[PDB]
Amino acid sequence: MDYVIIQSMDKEVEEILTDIDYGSFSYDYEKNTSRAISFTVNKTKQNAAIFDLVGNEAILTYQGQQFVIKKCTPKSIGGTISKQITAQHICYTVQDHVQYNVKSGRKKYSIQTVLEFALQDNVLGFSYEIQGSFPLVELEDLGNKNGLELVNLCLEEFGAILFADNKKLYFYDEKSWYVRTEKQFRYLYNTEEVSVDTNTDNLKTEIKCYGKQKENADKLTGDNKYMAVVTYTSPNEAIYGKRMANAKSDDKITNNDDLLIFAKKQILDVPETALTIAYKGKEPVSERDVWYFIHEPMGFETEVKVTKIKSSHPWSKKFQEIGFSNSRRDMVRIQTQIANQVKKASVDTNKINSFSSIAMNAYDSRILTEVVGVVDGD
Amino acid sequence: MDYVIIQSMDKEVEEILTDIDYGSFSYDYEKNTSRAISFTVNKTKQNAAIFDLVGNEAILTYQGQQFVIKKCTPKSIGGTISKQITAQHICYTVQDHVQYNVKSGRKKYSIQTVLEFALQDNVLGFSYEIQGSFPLVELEDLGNKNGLELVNLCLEEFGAILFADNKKLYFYDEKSWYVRTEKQFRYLYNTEEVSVDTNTDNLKTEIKCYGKQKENADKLTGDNKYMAVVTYTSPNEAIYGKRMANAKSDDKITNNDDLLIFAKKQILDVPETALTIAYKGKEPVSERDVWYFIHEPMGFETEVKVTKIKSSHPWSKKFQEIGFSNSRRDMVRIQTQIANQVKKASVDTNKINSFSSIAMNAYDSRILTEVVGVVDGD
Amino acid sequence: MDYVIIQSMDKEVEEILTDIDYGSFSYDYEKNTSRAISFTVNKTKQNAAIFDLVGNEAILTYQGQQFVIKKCTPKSIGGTISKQITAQHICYTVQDHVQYNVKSGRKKYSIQTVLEFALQDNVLGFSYEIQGSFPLVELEDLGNKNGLELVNLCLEEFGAILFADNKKLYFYDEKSWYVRTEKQFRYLYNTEEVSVDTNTDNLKTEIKCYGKQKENADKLTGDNKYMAVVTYTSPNEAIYGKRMANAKSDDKITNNDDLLIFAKKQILDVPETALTIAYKGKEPVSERDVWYFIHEPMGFETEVKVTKIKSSHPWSKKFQEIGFSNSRRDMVRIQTQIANQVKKASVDTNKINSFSSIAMNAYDSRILTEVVGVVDGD
């Protein structure tokens, strides 16, 4: 059903939210990033009975998917009372479950073990499924995070893609996520505006990396301080020249092959491009289908995998916006990155304060023990 | 008087600033946050004599209150010269006084002692008064800050509200600050637009907290590492379910009741709401009065305490904007929070660098003592 | 020539980029800050042959200067294909060369030595020239940075001004950079809008500074912890009174004269002003010339040195915007400052983690020495 079903916070009453301003309705999806619906509801005679129920923590069913309202803005301008509703997919509500226990130390985990640890003894009825092949990732002191943080960690590390059937989270890989379809994007046929953002500020074709630190680091000079020092040069240098970046240091590995693969992962030697298409066709576009893009004036004839969708209501007459190959820069993204880096630095210095305090604790005890030993020497 | 009195930086000449664009005039107040007036002045024949005096560091008297100009923007477009004046209440100028001395160590202070320490030997003629009851707060190495920083620390810790009669700062509590009044806000009578912003992204009802660390922490497992470990569950869970938050750690307390009250203070279990009212009545609204709000279509019949005012000049014909129950999100607030967190992290790293260096300094002397004892043993 | 010359990434074909939307063309310069050109190109018959060549990493010659394209935005709206081109001066491409070697320790360098170290064994054909006199600056572990970072460090430390003839970077000082000219800015003659931004939020006339830390810091009390403690008071206090700021600590000097000069450098005792002029005269304005500003209504009769230019194409009919005495506040600058402070804090904590681990590592050797001595004494 294309209409919205409203279920109250206490789940006592469930009805149909009518007279929604479908022109303002919008559904936003971005892989591993967001899944939400936003609209505006005006209080009229048809929905006056249930207009008081729509609020924060209410549930909206739309196209078989459940969204929890996370921001409600009632507004009264004369005779019109309007609520601006924003609801996120119920999967993100898994952040309300926190795994306090910590698996201390460095250990090689798989996606299955981390997912089982994250969603152990859930009280919100959350379940997970895995469909694909993923490598092993070594992690330090896993735990002490909420469910959403651990899910995001899994997505970032194992390179998985998460999609939720209400409260059941499926984790695919790149191979099993995208499905090929015969639907295609054609210039002048079903597309209006096509934009390509290309950036080459981080185009680097050379990198130098250092491994762990030798015990006699002070006694040694130069790259001899590390058992693993490697310089990686990308083949793209042949078309871009030598563009070397600032050195990155990993202090957890000792051999050279791991350093080489890490250095290869540490740079980006292809121009960063983001594609945006304004689509106004009749065929619906899902979150998994791969389309064929043909646009002669822009010199495009390829296969495009959808990574971002900004759809309107089917009755809203508006266009659809579809993204490929990551998203445009945007400023709030930069602010979020800075904020998370700040949080990481804050927790790091909080840990280092305790570490330095204990550095005095282990000092005096052994001082006393060996001073007693020295007295025994006398 | 409703007009503005301009006194020069050197206080040689004090006159009346006329021909002020009262339509652009605005007075902004927010409790413990801001108190300022902003407007625009055009150079005309009436104020040509004193138009050169209005500038940075000049004093403006408005309704018996003194504001120091902190931002002046002269602008020339043909024959019209305009200055955009922004002035902050003179109380904030107390930030020009810095208390360099530090009361090192952890100690339980009252508001009176901290206020006396902050404004000791002032050369700007600042005085303070306290009206209310406040608890005792334990602080570390109080001092080495300007007057405004210590005042903000007092406001944040003791839960006081600061209001300034020019250069005399009164510190009230919630009980003695708000005064009940018979004035009321009525829908369709003196209000035009009413907005309520509701957020439930921090709705948490369960928290786990850890106390100090035991001396034999490394040889202990789990919560045994701390003498104080407690899980606090809010009653609101009965209407919201279990929503665990990330664990918060306090390393300065040992018992369980203090950790319980700290954990209770550490979460927020009600929807975060902010109310904004556009008022166009004849009765003026002050910064302390508590009104009665009645708005049937939005289901309001309560008492509202003013926390933010954006008033216009009495001749400006414009509406007034009044806020209750904290303010809307906004980005500049987020940027200020991020900046202050960055500064705190930077100073923490600066202190910890010296701490590690003196750990190396306290190292070698004790190594020398050990060597002396070793030689004595032989 | 006033038109744009386009040279492909592979330098195979070099032609003239015609049908450029000169109305959108803009050239932005700011001393030690930026040098770039931005415009928009529409695909027409006159340039359809070479419209595919203009893209990222292409080279544009404009008025004898080379700019590398760093952001290209092809766009298709119906029958018009447009590319939004932003190109930075080729000098900044020197950031593609990284000096991995580090000159560890604290040492007094000159500008010549640092510049030679930065551009040693360049593969991009970069050369440097120095014209002026600069003092000696002491630095720690110079190196491990790209060319642009070291150039910016030189500009910030030695107080130099960088101007590039394509790939040849000239470094002047204040004396040899600005050249006096007879061209003047006159009110009502060749200027339209003149704006002055004045801020006095950081107006401080007193500061207290502490030198290095004594070895018996814990055994000593107060300012005796430092061999160098000095309070600097600016003469401008006579116009503004005492406005003392938060104390700044330098832990690398021991005498009092260096602390005094550092404290003098640490505060600003004059209002921070920024001047902007809209110029519409026939005489072109360069990046070095010093003009004479006369504006009676705003009380200006002085010499103004250009620090920022926003010029249009000579055929664009638009005004020119010229800045003096630093630039307006803006937010993106604040975000850049916050981001670089975050990066500095991150590298500081990354270094101090290894430092603390070494402190733990350095403990075990001395524990072994104590044990051996205890055994020997017995």
Side-chain angles (χ1 to χ4, degrees):
Chain A
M1 53 210 39
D2 273 353
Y3 36 89
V4 177
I5 314 284
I6 169 66
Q7 183 210 66
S8 283
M9 199 183 13
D10 54 351
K11 321 181 143 79
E12 276 307 276
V13 56
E14 171 161 80
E15 290 301 320
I16 292 168
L17 187 45
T18 186
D19 289 356
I20 290 183
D21 187 17
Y22 300 112
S24 61
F25 190 93
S26 173
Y27 164 76
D28 279 41
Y29 155 78
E30 189 184 346
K31 54 171 314 170
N32 309 337
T33 294
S34 39
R35 219 180 145 180
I37 53 154
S38 92
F39 55 93
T40 298
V41 219
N42 269 50
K43 169 150 185 301
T44 61
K45 318 206 322 267
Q46 281 78 38
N47 60 353
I50 64 105
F51 192 85
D52 322 321
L53 311 162
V54 37
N56 260 269
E57 297 309 289
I59 267 68
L60 310 162
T61 324
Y62 173 56
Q63 304 204 316
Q65 284 304 295
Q66 293 192 308
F67 297 82
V68 185
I69 295 180
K70 275 311 164 185
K71 166 89 164 22
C72 175
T73 307
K75 186 183 276 260
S76 164
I77 308 168
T80 74
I81 324 292
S82 65
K83 286 178 185 164
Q84 183 139 75
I85 296 317
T86 284
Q88 323 270 334
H89 197 269
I90 201 151
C91 57
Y92 300 115
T93 62
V94 85
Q95 68 178 113
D96 285 338
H97 170 267
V98 183
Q99 168 55 265
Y100 290 117
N101 314 133
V102 184
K103 292 189 169 188
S104 305
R106 259 217 162 199
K107 208 194 321 294
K108 272 203 153 49
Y109 307 91
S110 81
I111 178 159
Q112 278 93 351
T113 90
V114 185
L115 276 199
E116 183 93 332
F117 192 41
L119 314 176
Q120 241 171 19
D121 319 312
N122 277 347
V123 289
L124 322 158
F126 274 104
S127 57
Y128 70 100
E129 194 167 322
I130 306 199
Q131 178 153 344
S133 95
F134 307 92
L136 298 192
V137 178
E138 54 178 356
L139 305 156
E140 325 220 13
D141 43 69
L142 179 80
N144 202 35
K145 292 173 189 193
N146 60 66
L148 200 32
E149 272 166 312
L150 288 157
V151 168
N152 284 343
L153 180 71
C154 293
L155 295 181
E156 175 221 320
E157 294 294 333
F158 307 97
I161 300 152
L162 139 118
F163 209 51
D165 197 316
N166 290 330
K167 262 165 175 177
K168 177 169 202 8
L169 332 172
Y170 301 86
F171 291 77
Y172 313 83
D173 74 326
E174 183 112 350
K175 257 303 289 288
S176 34
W177 172 240
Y178 296 119
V179 294
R180 206 143 277 94
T181 50
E182 289 297 79
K183 297 177 288 182
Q184 74 199 235
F185 293 120
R186 277 255 190 201
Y187 149 77
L188 266 184
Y189 180 71
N190 46 5
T191 192
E192 157 78 88
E193 155 172 29
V194 189
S195 316
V196 177
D197 281 15
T198 318
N199 292 277
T200 51
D201 357 327
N202 328 58
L203 216 171
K204 304 300 196 190
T205 62
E206 181 148 276
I207 191 54
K208 190 165 184 179
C209 275
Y210 307 125
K212 212 187 152 321
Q213 192 82 294
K214 270 177 195 163
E215 59 281 352
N216 41 311
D218 41 23
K219 202 218 51 54
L220 266 173
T221 39
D223 59 337
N224 301 30
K225 286 145 209 179
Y226 333 86
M227 51 312 302
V229 174
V230 83
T231 294
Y232 166 63
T233 283
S234 151
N236 273 12
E237 147 163 300
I239 71 177
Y240 295 126
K242 321 196 47 58
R243 291 153 182 258
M244 42 203 198
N246 285 56
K248 298 268 149 235
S249 305
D250 190 6
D251 280 349
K252 286 320 195 112
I253 78 193
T254 38
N255 64 75
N256 260 10
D257 54 76
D258 297 328
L259 198 62
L260 196 61
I261 73 167
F262 167 76
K264 159 133 156 81
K265 208 184 312 163
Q266 274 305 309
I267 65 164
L268 172 273
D269 52 326
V270 181
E272 184 219 299
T273 177
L275 167 65
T276 294
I277 288 185
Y279 168 78
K280 199 27 151 175
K282 330 162 220 82
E283 324 189 71
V285 24
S286 69
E287 301 88 1
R288 326 189 40 193
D289 40 14
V290 161
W291 290 49
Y292 206 83
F293 187 36
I294 298 150
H295 201 117
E296 306 89 1
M298 298 273 290
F300 263 96
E301 192 172 317
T302 36
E303 286 201 354
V304 278
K305 330 180 153 192
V306 163
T307 78
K308 162 189 295 227
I309 290 174
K310 187 168 112 104
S311 277
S312 50
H313 199 273
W315 310 340
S316 165
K317 108 197 207 182
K318 284 165 46 62
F319 282 51
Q320 302 197 54
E321 183 136 282
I322 296 132
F324 318 87
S325 87
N326 86 77
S327 58
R328 329 188 70 173
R329 295 291 230 218
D330 194 0
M331 179 66 147
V332 300
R333 313 302 269 287
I334 301 169
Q335 316 281 13
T336 50
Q337 299 308 98
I338 293 185
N340 71 41
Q341 266 163 42
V342 159
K343 284 261 278 194
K344 293 203 241 222
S346 94
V347 308
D348 264 19
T349 179
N350 292 334
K351 281 160 184 165
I352 235 137
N353 190 358
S354 73
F355 185 78
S356 62
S357 59
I358 278 75
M360 323 318 249
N361 244 341
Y363 196 28
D364 309 347
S365 64
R366 305 163 194 172
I367 284 167
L368 291 170
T369 58
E370 278 125 8
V371 156
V372 165
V374 153
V375 173
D376 290 345
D378 285 346
Chain B
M1 23 198 65
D2 272 350
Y3 37 89
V4 176
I5 313 283
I6 168 66
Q7 183 210 62
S8 285
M9 167 181 19
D10 57 350
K11 320 180 142 78
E12 276 307 276
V13 36
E14 169 161 80
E15 289 301 320
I16 294 169
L17 186 45
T18 189
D19 290 356
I20 290 181
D21 187 17
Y22 300 110
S24 61
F25 189 92
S26 172
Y27 161 71
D28 279 44
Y29 156 78
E30 189 184 346
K31 56 170 315 170
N32 306 336
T33 296
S34 40
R35 217 180 147 181
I37 55 158
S38 93
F39 53 94
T40 297
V41 196
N42 271 52
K43 168 151 186 302
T44 61
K45 316 207 320 268
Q46 281 79 43
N47 60 353
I50 53 88
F51 190 85
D52 318 45
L53 312 170
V54 34
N56 258 271
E57 296 309 288
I59 274 66
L60 308 163
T61 323
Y62 175 59
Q63 307 209 318
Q65 285 300 293
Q66 291 191 305
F67 299 83
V68 185
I69 293 179
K70 275 313 166 184
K71 166 88 162 21
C72 174
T73 306
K75 185 184 278 262
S76 164
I77 316 156
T80 102
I81 322 293
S82 62
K83 283 180 185 163
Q84 183 136 75
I85 294 315
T86 289
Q88 323 269 335
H89 198 271
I90 202 151
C91 55
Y92 299 115
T93 60
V94 86
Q95 70 179 112
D96 284 336
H97 174 271
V98 181
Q99 168 57 265
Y100 289 115
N101 313 133
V102 183
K103 291 189 170 188
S104 305
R106 258 217 161 198
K107 207 194 321 293
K108 272 203 152 48
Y109 307 91
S110 84
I111 180 159
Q112 279 94 350
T113 89
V114 184
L115 277 196
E116 184 94 333
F117 190 42
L119 318 174
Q120 243 173 21
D121 317 311
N122 277 349
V123 288
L124 323 161
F126 274 105
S127 57
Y128 70 100
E129 193 167 322
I130 306 200
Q131 178 150 344
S133 96
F134 309 94
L136 298 190
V137 177
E138 57 177 357
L139 305 157
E140 327 221 12
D141 43 70
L142 178 79
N144 202 37
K145 292 173 189 193
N146 60 68
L148 202 33
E149 271 165 313
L150 292 158
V151 165
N152 286 345
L153 181 73
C154 293
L155 294 182
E156 174 222 319
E157 294 293 334
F158 306 97
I161 300 151
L162 140 118
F163 209 49
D165 198 317
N166 288 335
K167 262 166 174 176
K168 176 171 201 8
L169 331 168
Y170 300 90
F171 292 77
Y172 313 84
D173 73 327
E174 185 113 350
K175 258 303 291 288
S176 37
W177 171 240
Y178 295 120
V179 287
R180 206 142 278 94
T181 51
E182 286 305 85
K183 296 177 287 186
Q184 73 197 237
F185 291 117
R186 275 258 192 202
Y187 151 76
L188 267 183
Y189 179 70
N190 46 6
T191 191
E192 156 79 271
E193 154 173 29
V194 187
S195 317
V196 179
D197 279 17
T198 316
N199 289 278
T200 48
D201 46 355
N202 315 57
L203 198 63
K204 304 301 195 191
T205 60
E206 181 152 277
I207 190 54
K208 190 167 184 180
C209 275
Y210 306 125
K212 210 188 152 321
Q213 192 82 293
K214 267 177 194 163
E215 63 282 359
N216 43 313
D218 42 67
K219 63 205 73 33
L220 270 172
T221 37
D223 60 338
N224 297 28
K225 286 146 209 179
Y226 332 86
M227 51 312 302
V229 174
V230 49
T231 292
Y232 168 62
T233 282
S234 151
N236 273 13
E237 166 187 79
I239 70 175
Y240 296 124
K242 325 196 47 58
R243 289 147 180 255
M244 332 168 168
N246 283 56
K248 297 270 148 234
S249 307
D250 191 5
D251 280 350
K252 287 320 195 112
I253 78 193
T254 38
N255 64 75
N256 259 11
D257 55 75
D258 297 328
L259 198 61
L260 194 59
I261 72 168
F262 168 75
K264 156 134 156 80
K265 209 185 312 164
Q266 273 305 308
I267 64 163
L268 173 279
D269 54 324
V270 283
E272 184 219 299
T273 177
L275 169 62
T276 294
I277 289 188
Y279 167 78
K280 198 28 151 177
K282 305 161 296 322
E283 325 188 72
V285 23
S286 69
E287 302 88 1
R288 326 190 40 195
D289 41 15
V290 160
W291 293 48
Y292 206 82
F293 186 36
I294 299 148
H295 202 112
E296 306 90 0
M298 305 228 321
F300 264 92
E301 194 174 319
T302 38
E303 288 200 355
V304 281
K305 332 181 150 193
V306 163
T307 78
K308 161 190 296 227
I309 293 173
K310 187 168 112 105
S311 275
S312 51
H313 198 275
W315 310 339
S316 166
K317 109 198 206 183
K318 281 164 45 61
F319 281 49
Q320 303 200 53
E321 181 135 282
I322 297 131
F324 320 88
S325 85
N326 88 78
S327 61
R328 332 186 72 179
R329 298 289 229 216
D330 191 357
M331 178 90 24
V332 297
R333 336 280 317 254
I334 300 170
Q335 315 280 15
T336 52
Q337 299 308 98
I338 291 185
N340 71 40
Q341 266 164 42
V342 158
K343 284 260 279 194
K344 292 203 240 223
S346 92
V347 306
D348 265 19
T349 59
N350 298 336
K351 279 160 183 166
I352 233 137
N353 192 357
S354 73
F355 185 81
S356 62
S357 67
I358 64 97
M360 305 333 258
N361 236 340
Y363 194 38
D364 300 352
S365 54
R366 306 187 190 169
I367 303 322
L368 289 164
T369 66
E370 301 148 12
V371 177
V372 164
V374 158
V375 177
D376 287 348
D378 290 348
Chain C
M1 56 213 42
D2 271 353
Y3 36 90
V4 177
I5 311 284
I6 169 66
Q7 184 210 67
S8 283
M9 191 194 320
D10 55 352
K11 321 180 142 79
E12 277 307 276
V13 46
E14 173 161 80
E15 289 303 318
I16 301 168
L17 188 44
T18 191
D19 288 356
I20 289 182
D21 185 19
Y22 299 112
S24 59
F25 190 93
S26 171
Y27 161 75
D28 279 43
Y29 156 80
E30 188 184 346
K31 54 170 313 170
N32 306 338
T33 292
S34 39
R35 220 178 143 182
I37 55 158
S38 90
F39 57 95
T40 296
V41 226
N42 269 52
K43 170 155 191 304
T44 62
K45 315 204 321 268
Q46 284 81 42
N47 60 355
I50 63 102
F51 190 84
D52 317 342
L53 312 168
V54 34
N56 255 275
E57 296 312 290
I59 308 266
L60 308 162
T61 325
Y62 174 59
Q63 308 208 319
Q65 284 303 290
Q66 293 195 306
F67 299 83
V68 190
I69 299 182
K70 276 312 166 184
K71 165 85 161 21
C72 174
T73 307
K75 186 185 276 261
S76 163
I77 309 166
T80 100
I81 323 292
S82 61
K83 283 179 185 163
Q84 183 138 76
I85 297 316
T86 286
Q88 324 267 335
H89 196 275
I90 201 153
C91 55
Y92 299 105
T93 60
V94 86
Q95 69 180 114
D96 287 343
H97 173 270
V98 181
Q99 169 55 265
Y100 291 117
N101 314 134
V102 184
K103 292 189 169 188
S104 304
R106 259 218 164 201
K107 208 194 321 294
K108 273 203 152 47
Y109 308 91
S110 82
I111 180 162
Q112 276 96 352
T113 86
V114 185
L115 278 196
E116 185 94 335
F117 191 40
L119 316 175
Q120 243 174 22
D121 317 311
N122 277 350
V123 289
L124 322 160
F126 274 106
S127 56
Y128 70 101
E129 194 168 323
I130 305 198
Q131 177 151 344
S133 95
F134 308 93
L136 298 192
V137 178
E138 54 180 356
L139 305 158
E140 325 221 12
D141 44 69
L142 179 80
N144 201 35
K145 292 174 188 194
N146 60 67
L148 197 32
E149 274 165 312
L150 290 158
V151 167
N152 285 344
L153 178 72
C154 293
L155 294 182
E156 174 223 318
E157 293 294 333
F158 306 100
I161 297 150
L162 151 67
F163 209 53
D165 197 317
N166 291 333
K167 264 165 174 176
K168 177 169 201 7
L169 332 167
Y170 300 86
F171 291 78
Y172 312 83
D173 73 326
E174 183 111 350
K175 164 58 60 44
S176 39
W177 172 239
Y178 296 119
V179 288
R180 203 149 270 89
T181 48
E182 287 316 274
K183 301 176 289 184
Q184 74 198 236
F185 290 119
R186 277 255 191 202
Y187 148 78
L188 264 183
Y189 181 70
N190 47 5
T191 192
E192 157 77 88
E193 154 172 29
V194 192
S195 316
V196 179
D197 282 17
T198 318
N199 291 274
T200 49
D201 354 327
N202 322 51
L203 197 36
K204 306 298 198 191
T205 58
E206 181 152 278
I207 191 53
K208 191 166 186 179
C209 276
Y210 307 124
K212 213 189 154 322
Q213 192 81 292
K214 269 177 194 162
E215 59 281 353
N216 41 311
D218 36 27
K219 200 217 51 54
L220 267 174
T221 41
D223 60 337
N224 299 29
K225 285 145 208 178
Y226 332 86
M227 51 312 302
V229 173
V230 82
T231 294
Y232 168 63
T233 283
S234 149
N236 270 13
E237 156 193 74
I239 333 143
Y240 305 120
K242 327 193 47 57
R243 291 151 184 256
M244 50 210 195
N246 284 56
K248 299 268 148 234
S249 307
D250 190 6
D251 280 349
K252 288 320 194 112
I253 75 193
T254 39
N255 64 74
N256 259 10
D257 55 75
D258 297 328
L259 199 61
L260 195 60
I261 72 169
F262 169 75
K264 157 133 156 80
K265 210 183 312 164
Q266 274 305 307
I267 63 163
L268 175 47
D269 52 325
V270 91
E272 186 221 300
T273 181
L275 169 62
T276 299
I277 290 187
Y279 167 78
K280 199 29 149 176
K282 323 158 226 63
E283 326 188 71
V285 25
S286 70
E287 299 87 1
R288 328 188 40 192
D289 41 13
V290 161
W291 291 48
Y292 207 87
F293 187 39
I294 296 149
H295 201 112
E296 306 90 0
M298 305 234 297
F300 263 94
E301 191 174 317
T302 38
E303 292 200 356
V304 279
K305 329 179 153 189
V306 163
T307 78
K308 161 189 294 228
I309 292 174
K310 187 169 112 104
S311 276
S312 52
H313 198 270
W315 309 339
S316 168
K317 109 198 207 183
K318 283 165 46 61
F319 281 49
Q320 298 198 51
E321 177 133 281
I322 297 131
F324 321 87
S325 86
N326 87 78
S327 60
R328 331 188 70 177
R329 296 289 230 218
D330 193 356
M331 178 93 30
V332 297
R333 327 293 289 284
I334 300 170
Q335 316 280 17
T336 52
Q337 300 310 98
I338 292 185
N340 71 39
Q341 268 162 43
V342 158
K343 284 260 279 193
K344 292 203 239 222
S346 93
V347 313
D348 265 19
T349 179
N350 293 334
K351 280 160 183 166
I352 208 146
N353 189 358
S354 71
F355 185 80
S356 60
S357 63
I358 270 177
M360 301 326 243
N361 233 340
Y363 192 21
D364 300 353
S365 64
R366 270 72 137 190
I367 299 172
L368 294 171
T369 64
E370 309 194 37
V371 163
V372 169
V374 158
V375 175
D376 291 348
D378 281 343

